Design a protein around this ligand. Sequence first.
Ligand SMILES: *[C@@H]1O[C@H](CO)[C@@H](O)[C@H](O)[C@H]1NC(C)=O
Ligand SMILES: [Zn+2]
Length: 1016
Amino acid sequence: QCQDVVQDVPNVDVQMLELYDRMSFKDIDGGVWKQGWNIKYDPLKYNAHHKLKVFVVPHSHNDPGWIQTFEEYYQHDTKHILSNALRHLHDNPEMKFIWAEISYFARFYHDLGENKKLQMKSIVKNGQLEFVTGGWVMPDEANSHWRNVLLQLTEGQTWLKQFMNVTPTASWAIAPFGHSPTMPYILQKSGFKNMLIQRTHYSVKKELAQQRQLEFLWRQIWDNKGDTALFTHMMPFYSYDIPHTCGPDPKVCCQFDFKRMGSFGLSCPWKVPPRTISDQNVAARSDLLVDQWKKKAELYRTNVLLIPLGDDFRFKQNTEWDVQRVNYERLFEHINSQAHFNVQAQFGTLQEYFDAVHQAERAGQAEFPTLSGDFFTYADRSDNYWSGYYTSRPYHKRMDRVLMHYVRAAEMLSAWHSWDGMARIEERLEQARRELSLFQHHDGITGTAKTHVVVDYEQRMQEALKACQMVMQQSVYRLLTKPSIYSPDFSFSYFTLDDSRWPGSGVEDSRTTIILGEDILPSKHVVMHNTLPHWREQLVDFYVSSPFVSVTDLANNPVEAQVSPVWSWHHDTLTKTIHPQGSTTKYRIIFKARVPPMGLATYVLTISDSKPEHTSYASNLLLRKNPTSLPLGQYPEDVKFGDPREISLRVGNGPTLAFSEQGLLKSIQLTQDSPHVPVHFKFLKYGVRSHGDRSGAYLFLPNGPASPVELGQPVVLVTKGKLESSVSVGLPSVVHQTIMRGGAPEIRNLVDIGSLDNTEIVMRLETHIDSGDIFYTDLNGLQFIKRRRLDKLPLQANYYPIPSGMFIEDANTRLTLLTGQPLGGSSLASGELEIMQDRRLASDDERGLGQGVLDNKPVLHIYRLVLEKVNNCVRPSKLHPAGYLTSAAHKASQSLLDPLDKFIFAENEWIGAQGQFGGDHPSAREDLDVSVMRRLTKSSAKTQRVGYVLHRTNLMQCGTPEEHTQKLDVCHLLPNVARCERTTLTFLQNLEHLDGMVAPEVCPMETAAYVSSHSS
Ligand SMILES: *[C@@H]1O[C@H](CO)[C@@H](O)[C@H](O)[C@H]1NC(C)=O
Ligand SMILES: [Zn+2]
């Protein structure tokens, strides 16, 4: 019996939206604890029978790229940290150390000799070195897709299981800029029992500290029962550094960072240095430190206290290891032997802390509050809200989503077969998984790294994309070639991928033209892949060398097609206009491809002398004053010209869209009779303050509300076809395109902020929808959370991550904007949605980057815009913290994130070609996805194993019967199944042995993993 995720409002002790509504967010000087209060404790609270147990947990924050590349940091810092950790922990059996970033650890371990590898395994086995989380990285939680968060977790933990024989059940997230409940969701379904977070709004820290609610059972916003709950520890202070982790007073704590005495080139900003602990000072030093501890202990419910001891790239030098260890050893010996302190202090690990906490809990010493919600948007001080990185480096943000999909497609396409080692499938896939996983780092996708580091991430992702293409194309060739004919060269390109949207038209001329000709090649095979587990029809396009091309399927059935020109926009530095030029030698052919669930479908493009029967040609209308001619070679329809004017378009029986004379949407009419609903696109700009704090890669600090971009009299291009129409306009910084295929329009923005310093470009939608102060944004492409605009907070605080979609609604109408890339956005007034396109910032914003953002490049952002009637929809009550997509909006999101893949046959003739693969695959219910299909065994394994991650979303019931689908049982997708098991999401632990080898489908909002075993 599935939990109902719509109708029952969870009863929880803290609900973060409710908390937000109540809190005053005053930023007052709380004293030595600047954002708290002077903590008082009763010295009689602890005694002989009730001691304070203190765990000091040494750690070292290692960024996989930030100010230096991954390899640069590894060479200069991390390899030394790990080498000296091995030595010092080996030699000092009571010393402890926690490690988070497996990308660095794997890099190090593989360079070790066998002697050292064994020493390393020993200190892990004995508990001295403990892995926390065990992901490839410590990912950003704002921009990251849940699928990639899982990918990187799996990458690190699979490595740890194989080489260290351990799987972390405690998570450590000290650094992501705000925190998402997507983390406890994934972690709890991956065997975790505890997690730790740090970067939350200073006001939230204060509020929760006051109620001792810094430790909580974090459940999902829709979870009535509490089964998703994961124990969470929120750190109470401003930083994870040593001054902000011993207790409330950094002036005191800094004195217990023994790296800060001078020889290391570090010091205490509070002007009192650390002093070496001696017999003459240990009593006084201990009195100071124990007092700090006991103050921190006031903020929590048990007699077990966590004291992290670390900072960025700490525990490098041998001398640093000694200086920290020896001084702390002296403090522990004194403190533990002075009964009057009633403290037992020691080095410990994160798991040890959590174990002792739950022992206190079980002894009836504490009960913990329940909590739901998220921890965006983070501010570490004053009005410095970290909403800028929701948008920074948007090119690579978009790239992340493209690579996300190519990794899935490559792993899925290649999973169907076992491959010979010589094929290098596993090699290429591991590379792709690792480069994407690396980019999930909280300085990767966030766009907060130095210019040369961003370049490194981009290069790595480009290599991953090539790896995916190689795997995908070899897989297509095998799946669609008669087996007795199949003769692979594992280095040969049988197909090239054709991608219409990445890097995108106007970004890179990368697409190949299918060159046909009576005197060279009459025809060309193309293949579409559909990674979704349901039948899909979708328009696909290819470049061809002639407009006289027709399409057939592999049964030679004619397929209706449309040919359009290839239009490119040019900032004409002579006329000072932005205007389109048409190709005279290549054309776009568009047709509907119909592709099996998780399958393949083949089509043939054939040239003729004249207009083919089943091919139509789009009309084109250029709207501008002072037109010049636009010849189009063989294209059979002459371009038409006119003065700027309002226009209306309708494709198929879909919506009718009206545009302004500047080429921007002004209204949508859903059906013939229905109203023309005001929906207006507008481009505006935010600036930067000329006094006080400046915006940078992290911070969004606007100098007031956005000002409209002055548009002049822009050139508007209207293309009208039977299958696809569009309106495109050359705006300053943006070629804005609205594309229509008979349903929700697609929006593409080619964004080039050029040399506009201290500017952020925003795309806004203005409607009449009576949303008031409510809007919805998603978390990690997993769930939609209710947002409430708060005027008591500054503009930038009302910006949230838009990792994949946002909506506003009233009783009757909803507008949903879906994205192909994470960007920052808000609803700043009733009826509005807005989302940032790019930002170019001259100054550094004081968080350590030491540069602005002046490395912008052209990016093609993609969207779907869904206007819907929702009055018949069964929606959550007004008190529910969640929202849910409709079927239409969810399908539009899928179109952006997981489109059909397109393959062009490279050679002249494809001998033994087949028309279809997967025609017999079950077409599963629309709310179910096979998020991951991955073969887990190499070819030499007698028992083959294939892992599946199934995700079921929740779609609103709006009265559409939408019925008759087949049960998807992933365990029978490959033949000769011998066993079927439910696993953790990482595939690392078997949870359930499945009757009849049948994998059940999952509940709405649930995610499960299954592994099928095959004897043949
Ligand atoms: C892996 O750890 C387990 C306990 O979880 C132990 O039984 C097994 O021997 C270990 N594998 C080794 C030491 O190779
Ligand atoms: Zn970091």
